[PDB]
Design a protein around this ligand. Structure first.
Ligand SMILES: Nc1ccn([C@@H]2O[C@H](COP(=O)(O)CP(=O)(O)OP(=O)(O)O)[C@@H](O)[C@H]2O)c(=O)n1
Ligand SMILES: [Mg+2]
Ligand SMILES: [Zn+2]
Ligand SMILES: [Zn+2]
Ligand SMILES: [Zn+2]
Lengths: 63, 244, 1473, 76, 63
RNA sequence: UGCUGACU
DNA sequence: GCCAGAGACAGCGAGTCAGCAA
DNA sequence: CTGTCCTCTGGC
């Protein structure tokens, strides 16, 4: 049973101490899902106004 | 890089006697072209320069917290007052001399102290040169990595932009004489590449399908084409080719 | 010594299965292929007779090692027959339509014989014979058709070689596809009426004949063997002499072991995916061979035999196509996946090989190496080696290289021997390298692999290669101690390099014949102009623009010593004296001007023999930028006669103008563009280099450029107005929203919030966008009010002395939208063209009340980057900046595919030696490239308005290029006489649409006849009483051979380019160029008269000059213009209101060629007559759709007796613009709605388990359910109906049905038109124009209004509807105009010569064909068409048809290792003996 | 006899390349070289002097060809 | 960024570990930089930058 | 080959 | 035989560097 | 995630 998850990869990742600002950002990251990296429509990438105070507007990978 | 998204490579190491010295004896250690501001609008670097120069001058430590300086209380007003209180000028410009001609430049320059980070991407980790070396053994082409020697991929976009020049022989060189180039020989009558077979040692390739050895002729053909003919035979398809 | 033998053709067929034998070294039988330790197990897949897989062993079949042995083929012999997976589906059809009893196809022999004969004629190329045979048949079987077909095939043989052309492959494709699609369905058998032994195949590996037996491949094989016998004459043509045996497999072929390399997978050290599929087949073969022996030692046993058969068949399927079988696991990818995909084998290792002798490194700015050079960092130079052959005139410098060694720079890593090879010098003893420095010149000479030697040619590429200029050749300037490749900044825009970590590749030609082409063709100065629109590409950037604009300004004076040392530092001259100037000011102190520095730098660069150029143009910096102080008026002075806005170079000496980006830049017609025209591309590169050096020395020595905070600051007393305007802007929300909801003008302050909420939670959501738009307009008015207060004159420092202005204003960097948004306003945020979205509760951000009217709550940012933006504004700005990046990614993802498709179809179109644009198979696409020839980059100065430049610089242009030699070796009589004839004709016929004719010309007696002659008759045969007199007088009562009304009515001579071969025929130019030349000669002979200068040029020398300059701009034969058109449509898109925009529209037009477009439209002008204007109001009101649902108030349904009262709307508010009447509307319910209602009731109930009187009666005459409706003698007062189904029906809220039906029920509408509208004005020149635009498409339903509207000038964006009402030559121009209007919305402008070629190719064969995967089916190249997409379907096709390939495409020429048939390879060299 | 009299740029490129590949294979130089080690510079020197005995065989799209001399071809 | 990634060398045995020799603390920094002491692990150096067009080698993003 | 980071 | 019901089915930018696990 | 095929299926 997939554990009621919907994702079966990228569940754990390497935490790299290149800097202490790369390391501290692995324990505050939130991944919408690894399957959404393959989608024609871009609507799970919209920065809605309901993530005010819960997700940072600026801190998102830029590719 | 700076703390404002202004990344750039190091292009020169300017001698210390050719740098424009200021009227205070100083000499910058970073030269930053003023044309990254107009299109990128990083006005925070121009404020960090003045804040850091005021800090180094007064022994202080200013905060760059967002949303602490309004339209009424501006940041430029604050830090220009700090500078003017140290004998420098409000707008943060000190006038330099030319370290090459020795003359006071006509424009007064904007100098300050900013915090630079050094990025982990170095030319020492991203540079490759291949002449000859390893090869993929299925296609007999360069291997394709940097830790392994590895060749750079030409690409279909590049193949389609190189034959818009009309240079068919640059294309021949790149795609044929550099990547893969073999001498697979064919039976001319049967016109088949799989049919010629060597003998047991006067070593004459003899065609298996028709037993003649006067009909075999060598053809210069890529290696992936012979792989393609083999994998087609695997499917019972036949590639009959007309030799001239 | 190469093989010397070349390939002419490649055909794909099927192997016999008996000739594969003898193509086999041994049969493999051992399943376990991996030995206990990892070596080859004998008789397994990896064997030593199938070749040495690795260099360790030698093959048993031929003694020879790896890297020298061509591998051998082997065969897993199968226990029993299996169907082949590729020829399988066809087999199914060959069994579906057939009588298993009779063994004959169920098709009428008419179709069989017709198609047989059509194929017989197609095999030779005859293409009219197809329809001729079909019509011969229909008018009439074998003897009737075979006579004609044999006559064709005999009289039209010698055409088997000229049959592999498009238009001959499309016909065969269509014929065979229609056959397989329409005539192979199961049918009752002709001869025996009961021969439908229905084969019906389940998933692959399963065919089941009924009386539900399982078809065994042996029974199916025998059926095919006995069906071929009866129907072979026909199928040998549908399949090529195909034997039916090929449809079945009795063995599987194991490919040579060198092509199957053991790698590793989880928990397995040595495994190839292909051997794991073949091992599964071998394992099933072994289990099956056991059951057969069990039968021999003898329902479960045979049920098991039939189950293991199906399993073995899915194992042989997977071996061919991993995903043919979906119910098996341990399935590694088959051959369809080895060949067909982006990973694949064609798009990788076939079109995208990896290359040797190439480097890649980060690029760095240089600027002190010439524009045609690359800096190599002594680490590539010591590794990159060129193989130079040793000869008497180089053996000296080669000797120093072998002595210098492998590691010193002018050295060499190796020397190849005459017969032997590869004696490496890399030793560092320095004595054996000297021992071998001799014996050079001691057959093919020794070749020294020398290093890069500071003059070599290198091809440089940046990886998103979107245009021809992304690969250019450079001249190897070697630099010591670096690992970066240094490149000039003029070559940046060409590559899009940005020096922020920008790795770039450098390729090193190794042939001495690719060096000639890198020097001549791919050079980086032949690449000055972009091929998209001919405008310059190389130019100076950034501080070379602010330096040159501040030095060439009027008040810059230099002493002798700053004048010098500024000239010599730009020149760095190497030969000959420096020609200096004279001081402009000679007296109080000798002083120069800065324009004099540029002048004296310009007269030294221009080649010694040639003479300096004259040039007149405009500067980028407007002459209004300098107006500090209000301008006053002087009576006789035109301020622009003496302005810094007009650039005037007179004999190489700048006399006026600033010389900003408009010159030195990427703008056309500047100083460097004219230098490149008159003196060539090397002189323009020299000018660029020297000007860069000069403008750097200026800023580095005497001046300086910076950007502080006192040039972005804003004056006080100007921020007070900004603050008051921002305060005023905080009160404009209520009015905006209210007046957009058309609410009561005032008195509602909470009804507006509720209306906004309703519009927000609505379903359609187009009354919400209305509010968004009418709110953005208010905010934009306020934003524009604020910019004017601060930006022009509210800045503390102005343009001459502001550093931000003078950087955006001279084209250095940035725009005026950046200068603002740094000062005085950030603007209105817009995400999807709309304001930021609201939450689910009606608030846009947690800080804002729900449904807040202030513009601040909708993303109107009044803060600037000078004084930062608050948190809420920060949020919206981040939303916008993030959507930008998302859109970038997705846009590029789509553009790449569009461009790949385009380039894969238009790649083989090259200009031929007869100036005609032909494809690979010879199909004429165009008879003249741009419709006139004249490749784009050379036609830049042939425009008018550029003749006064060619006239001024005439002496330089004739000496430098054409010379007196060509002008007098020209003979223009043939073409000049043709134009005289054309001019005379057009003189005798001013109106060229007046129906010229001989007999028509003999209607001038019209009065002679109408007077008295024809007064007595009737319409004898329908013509007239008076027309018969004219017919009689003309017919035979006129002279025999002197009735020459013909000459007065003859056609215009055909255009000169058509008859007189523009290349070899002087003065044969286009009809639009000669008109321009006439106009300019007439406007130039009337300027010389009042010129106070002496002109030594005559109108008839200027004419010859222009004619030569035309004849020479003529698209060299071999140009390959289709690839240029592809790349020119691609690059602009890849980079970059009720219609579609962007790549969606381009893909609709080019890639899909759809008949259904999202936004179809029309536009007919209105005829400009008083009656037409009045009738149009009614016309607009006549074509809009009125639907039952648009006219209804509410239904009242009572319920098995279901009543229904419609209660229609009053006419006050819907008859105004719908043209409806209540009797028509109600009559509609009686005849259409009240019966579609019973239609839907049955739709549900089929799968559930005095005058009022006649109308009611006829209505219930037709239906048995209704009882009686109503009548409304007063404006539809109460109009109900009653139904009843009394026995048993599903009584639910049927209102659902009668509401889902009362929406798609439309009273009446023109088919296809959804609404019209008259956009009042469309012109300023003749503003009087009116246009009746539409949002649907029905061309014929407008033909009835040829008096209200202009039906010529009718336009639509459909291109399939135009192609059906007006033809294909009319759809070509719609295609071209659509592409042009798509590119126009972004300012992009592709040259018309590219869209002409694209539209001519798309509409080549009579239909609007898409430029996509289904357009390549009509293509004569199997090797192409499989390098694009669906490579396995296109291979199966080419294989079951015996399709032959001629190796004439670029793809087929790069697959078999040939030289492409365009550009440099288009001719031989034929050394004479 | 009907094609253009001038030498297209592709023809110049291929003729220079072939003459250079010949010179480099020890072919006699009919141009009196003056100390240059590049075979392409020598090939350009020969093309400017009108000493190249090569026959450009221009192919028409139907197989028909026309044989032009590199000497009888107007080099721009 | 190449910075000061950690204090315990001789113990980590990572794969790559980039270290900057003499980091400094920004003279201009947000106050939150001081709540999570980020000077235990510095990331860059203070430099005297002049915004001038002087060399010809610092154009188009180069420094 | 795969997958997780990252560069233009 | 006329044309909806689908239900498969195929396509989805270019290049580059690592590490880690199987 | 879209648009054509395109091969049925199914109803008529
Ligand atoms: N995924 C990607 C990302 C980038 N690229 C290529 O890199 C260039 C610069 O990227 P970029 O992101 O720096 C755009 P630029 O205009 O230079 O940025 P600026 O406004 O800060 O100056 C793009 O224009 C593409 O050619 C690509 O091929 N694929
Ligand atoms: Mg970049
Ligand atoms: Zn043979
Ligand atoms: Zn062998
Ligand atoms: Zn039958």
């Amino acid at each position: 049973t997939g554990l009621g998850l919907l994702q079966d990869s990228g569940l754990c990742v390497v935490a790299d101490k290149l800097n202490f600002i790369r390391y501290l950002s692995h324990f505050r990251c939130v991944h919408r899902g690894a399957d959404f990296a393959k989608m024609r429509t871009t609507t799970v990438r919209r920065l809605l106004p309901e993530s005010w105070g819960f997700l940072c507007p600026v801190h998102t990978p830029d590719g | 890089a700076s703390r404002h998204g202004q990344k750039g490579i190091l292009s020169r190491l300017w001698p210390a006697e050719d740098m424009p010295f200021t009227e205070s004896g100083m000499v910058p250690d970073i030269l930053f072209n003023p044309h990254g501001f107009p299109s990128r609008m990083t006005i925070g670097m121009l404020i960090e320069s003045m804040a850091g120069k005021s800090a180094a001058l007064h022994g202080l430590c200013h905060d760059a917290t967002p949303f602490i300086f309004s339209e009424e209380n501006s940041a430029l007003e604050y830090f220009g007052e700090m500078l003017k209180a140290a004998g420098y000028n409000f707008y943060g410009t000190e006038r330099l001399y030319s370290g090459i001609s020795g003359l006071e430049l006509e424009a007064d320059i904007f100098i300050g102290v900013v915090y630079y980070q050094r990025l982990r991407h170095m030319v020492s980790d991203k540079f490759q040169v291949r002449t000859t070396g390893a090869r993929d053994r299925v296609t007999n082409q360069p291997i394709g990595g940097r830790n392994v020697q590895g060749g750079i991929r030409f690409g279909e976009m590049e193949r389609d932009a190189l034959l818009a020049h009309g240079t068919s022989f640059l294309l021949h060189d790149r795609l044929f004489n550099c990547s893969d180039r073999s001498v697979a020989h064919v039976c001319v009558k049967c016109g088949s590449l799989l049919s010629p077979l060597l003998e047991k040692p006067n070593r004459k390739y003899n065609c298996t399908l028709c037993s003649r050895s006067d009909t075999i002729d060598t053809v210069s053909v890529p290696y992936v084409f012979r792989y393609f003919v083999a994998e087609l035979a695997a499917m019972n398809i036949k590639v009959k080719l007309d030799v001239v | 010594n190469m093989p010397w033998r070349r390939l002419q053709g490649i055909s794909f067929g099927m192997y016999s299965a008996e000739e594969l034998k003898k193509l086999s070294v041994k049969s493999i039988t051992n399943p376990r292929y991996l030995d206990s330790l990892g070596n080859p197990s004998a008789n397994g897949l990896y064997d030593l007779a199938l070749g040495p897989a690795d260099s360790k062993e030698v093959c048993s079949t031929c003694v020879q090692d790896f890297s020298n042995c061509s591998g051998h083929l082997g065969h897993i012999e199968l226990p029993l027959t299996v169907y082949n997976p590729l020829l399988f589906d066809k087999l199914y059809l060959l069994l579906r339509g057939s009588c298993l009893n009779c063994h004959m196809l169920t098709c009428p022999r008419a179709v069989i014989h017709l198609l047989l004969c059509q194929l017989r004629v197609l095999e030779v190329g005859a293409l009219q014979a197809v329809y001729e045979l079909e019509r011969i048949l229909n008018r009439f079987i074998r003897e009737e058709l075979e006579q004609y077909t044999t006559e064709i095939v005999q009289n039209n043989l010698l055409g088997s070689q000229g049959a592999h052309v498009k238009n001959v492959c499309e016909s065969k494709s269509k014929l065979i596809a229609l056959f397989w699609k329409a005539h192979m369905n199961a049918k009752r058998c002709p001869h025996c009426k009961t021969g439908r032994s229905v084969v019906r195949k389940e998933h692959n590996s399963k065919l089941t004949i009924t009386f539900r037996g399982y078809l065994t491949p042996t029974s199916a094989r025998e059926h095919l063997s006995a069906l071929w016998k009866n129907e072979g004459f026909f199928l040998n043509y549908l399949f090529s002499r195909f034997n039916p045996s090929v449809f079945f497999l009795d063995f599987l072929v194991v490919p040579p072991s060198r092509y199957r390399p053991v790698s590793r997978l989880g928990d397995q050290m040595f495994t190839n995916g292909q051997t794991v599929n073949l091992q599964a087949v071998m394992k099933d073969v072994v289990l099956i061979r056991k059951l057969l022996a069990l039968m021999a030692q003898e329902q479960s046993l045979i049920d098991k035999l039939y189950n293991i058969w199906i399993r073995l068949q899915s194992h042989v399927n997977i071996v061919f196509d991993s995903e043919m079988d979906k119910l098996m696991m341990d399935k590694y990818p088959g051959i369809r996946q080895i060949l067909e995909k982006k990973e694949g084998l064609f798009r990788k290792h076939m079109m995208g090989k990896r290359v040797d002798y190439a480097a890649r490194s980060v690029i760095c700015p240089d600027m002190y190496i010439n524009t045609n050079e690359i800096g190599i960092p002594m680490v590539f130079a010591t590794k990159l080696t060129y193989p130079q052959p040793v000869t008497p005139w180089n053996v000296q410098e080669l000797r120093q290289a072998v002595i210098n060694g492998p590691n010193v720079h002018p050295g060499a890593s190796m020397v190849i021997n005459e017969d032997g090879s590869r004696t490496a010098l890399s030793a560092v003893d320095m004595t054996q390298r000297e021992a071998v420095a001799k014996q050079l010149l001691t057959q093919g000479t020794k070749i020294v692999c020398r290093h890069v030697k500071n003059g070599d040619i290198l091809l440089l590429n940046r990886q998103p290669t979107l245009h021809r200029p992304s690969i250019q050749a450079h001249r190897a300037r070697i630099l010591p101690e670096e690992k970066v490749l240094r490149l000039h900044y003029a070559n940046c825009k060409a590559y899009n390099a940005d020096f922020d970590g920008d790795e770039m590749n450098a390729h090193f030609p190794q042939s001495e014949l690719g060096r000639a082409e890198a020097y001549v063709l791919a050079c980086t100065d032949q690449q000055y102009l972009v091929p998209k629109d001919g405008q310059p590409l190389a130019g100076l950037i950034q501080d070379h623009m602010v330096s040159g604009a501040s030095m060439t300004t009027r008040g810059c004076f230099f002493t002798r010593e700053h004048y010098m040392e500024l000239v010599y530092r730009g020149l760095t001259d190497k030969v000959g004296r420096v020609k200096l100037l004279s001081p402009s000011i000679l007296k109080p102190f000798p002083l120069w001007t800065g324009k004099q520095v540029v002048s004296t730098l310009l007269i030294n660069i221009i080649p010694e023999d040639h003479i300096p150029l004259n040039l007149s143009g405009k500067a980028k910096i407007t002459g209004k930028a300098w107006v500090k102080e209000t301008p006053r008026s002087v009576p006789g002075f035109n301020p622009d006669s003496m302005c810094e806005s007009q650039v005037i170079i007179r004999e190489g000496e700048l006399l006026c103008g600033v010389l900003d980006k408009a010159h030195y830049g990427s703008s056309a017609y500047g100083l460097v563009h004219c230098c490149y025209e008159i003196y060539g591309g090397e002189t323009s590169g020299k000018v660029l280099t020297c000007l860069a050096r000069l403008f750097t020395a200026y800023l580095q020595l005497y001046r300086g450029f910076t950007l502080g905070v006192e040039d972005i600051l804003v004056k006080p007393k100007a921020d007070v107005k900004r603050q008051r305007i921002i305060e005023e802007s905080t009160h404009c929300g209520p009015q905006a929203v209210r007046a957009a909801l058309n609410l009561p003008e005032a008195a509602s302050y909470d009804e507006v919030r509720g209306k906004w909420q309703d519009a927000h939670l609505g379903k359609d959501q187009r009354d919400f966008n209305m509010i968004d738009l009418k709110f953005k307009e208010e905010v934009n008015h306020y934003s524009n009010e604020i910019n004017k207060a601060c930006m022009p004159f509210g800045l503390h420092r102005q343009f001459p002395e502001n550093s931000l202005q003078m950087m955006v204003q001279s084209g250095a960097k940035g725009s005026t939208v950046n200068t603002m948004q740094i000062s005085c306003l950030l603007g209105q945020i817009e995400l999807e063209g709309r304001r930021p979205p609201l939450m689910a509760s009606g608030k846009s951000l947690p800080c804002f009340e729900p449904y807040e009217f202030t513009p601040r709550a909708g993303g109107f940012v009044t803060g600037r980057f000078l004084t930062g933006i608050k948190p809420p504004e920060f949020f919206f700005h981040c939303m916008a900046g993030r959507e930008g990046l998302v859109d970038t990614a997705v846009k590029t993802s789509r553009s790449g595919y569009l461009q790949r498709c385009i380039i894969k179809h238009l790649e083989g179109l090259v200009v031929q030696y007869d100036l005609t644009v032909r494809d690979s198979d010879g199909s004429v696409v165009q008879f003249l490239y741009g419709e006139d020839g004249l490749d784009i980059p050379k036609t830049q100065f042939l425009q008018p308005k550029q003749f006064p430049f060619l006239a001024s610089n005439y002496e330089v242009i004739m000496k430098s290029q054409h010379l007196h030699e060509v002008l007098s070796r020209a003979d223009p009589k043939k073409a000049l006489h043709h134009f005289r004839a054309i001019k005379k004709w057009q003189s005798k016929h001013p109106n060229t649409l007046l129906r010229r004719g001989a007999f028509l010309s003999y209607s001038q007696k019209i009065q002679e006849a109408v007077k008295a002659l024809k007064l007595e008759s009737e319409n004898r045969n329908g013509r007239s009483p008076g027309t018969q007199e004219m017919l009689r007088m003309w017919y035979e009562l006129d002279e025999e051979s002197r009735r020459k009304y013909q000459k007065k009515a003859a056609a215009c001579p055909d255009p000169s380019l058509s008859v007189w071969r523009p290349d070899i025929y002087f003065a044969s130019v286009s009809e639009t160029f000669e008109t321009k030349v006439d106009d300019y000669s007439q406007e130039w002979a009337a300027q010389t008269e009042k010129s106070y200068e002496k002109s030594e040029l005559s109108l008839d020398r200027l004419r010859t000059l222009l004619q030569l300059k035309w004849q020479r701009s003529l698209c060299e034969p071999g140009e390959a213009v289709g690839l240029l058109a592809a790349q020119s449509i691609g690059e602009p898109s890849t980079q970059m209101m009720n219609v579609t925009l962007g790549i969606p529209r381009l893909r609709e037009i080019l890639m899909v060629a759809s008949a259904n477009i999202k936004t179809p439209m029309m536009s007919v002008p209105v005829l400009n007559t008083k009656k037409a204007l009045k009738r149009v109001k009614s016309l607009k009101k006549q074509l809009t759709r009125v639907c039952l649902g648009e006219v209804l108030q509410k239904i009242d349904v009572q319920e098995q007796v279901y009543q229904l009262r419609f209660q229609f709307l009053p006419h006050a508010y819907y008859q105004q613009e719908k043209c409806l009447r209540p009797e028509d509307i109600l009559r509609f319910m009686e005849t259409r709605f009240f019966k579609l209602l019973m239609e839907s009731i049955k739709k549900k109930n089929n799968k559930a388990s005095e005058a009022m009187e006649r109308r009611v009666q006829a209505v219930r005459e037709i239906h048995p359910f209704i009882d009686d409706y109503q009548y409304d003698t007063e404006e539809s007062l109460w109009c109900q109906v009653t139904v009843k189904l009394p026995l048993m029906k599903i009584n639910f809220d049927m209102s659902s049905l009668v509401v889902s039906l009362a929406h798609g029920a439309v009273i009446y509408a023109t088919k296809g038109i959804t609404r019209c509208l008259l956009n009042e004005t469309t012109n300023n020149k003749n503003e009087k124009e009116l246009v009746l635009n539409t949002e649907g498409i029905n061309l014929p339903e407008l033909f009835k209004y040829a008096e209200v509207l202009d039906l010529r000038r009718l336009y639509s964006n459909d291109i399939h509807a135009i192609a059906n009402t007006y033809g294909i030559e009319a759809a070509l121009r719609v295609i071209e105009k659509e592409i042009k209007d798509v590119f126009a919305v972004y300012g992009i402008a592709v040259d018309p010569r590219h869209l002409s070629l694209v539209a001519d190719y798309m509409c080549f064969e009579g239909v609007y064909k898409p430029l996509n995967r289904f357009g390549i089916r009509s293509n004569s190249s199997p090797l192409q068409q499989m390098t694009f997409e669906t490579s396995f379907q296109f291979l199966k096709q080419a294989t079951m048809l015996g399709s032959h390939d001629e190796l004439r495409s670029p793809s087929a020429c790069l697959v078999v290792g040939k030289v492409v048939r365009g550009g440099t390879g288009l001719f031989e060299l034929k050394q004479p003996l | 006899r009907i094609t253009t009299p001038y030498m297209t740029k592709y023809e110049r490129a291929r003729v220079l390349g072939t003459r250079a590949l010949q010179i480099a294979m020890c072919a006699p130089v009919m141009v009196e070289l003056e100390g240059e080690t590049d075979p392409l510079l020598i090939a350009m020197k020969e093309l400017k002097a009108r000493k190249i005995p090569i026959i450009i065989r221009r192919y028409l799209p139907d197989g028909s060809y026309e044989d032009w001399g590199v000497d009888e071809l107007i080099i721009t | 960024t190449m910075g000061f990634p950690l204090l315990t060398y001789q113990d980590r045995s990572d794969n790559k570990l980039y270290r900057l020799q003499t980091p400094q603390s920004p003279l201009v920094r947000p106050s939150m930089y001081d709540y999570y002491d980020m000077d235990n692990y510095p990331i860059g150096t203070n430099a005297i930058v002049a915004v001038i067009s002087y060399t010809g080698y610092d154009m188009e993003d180069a420094m």
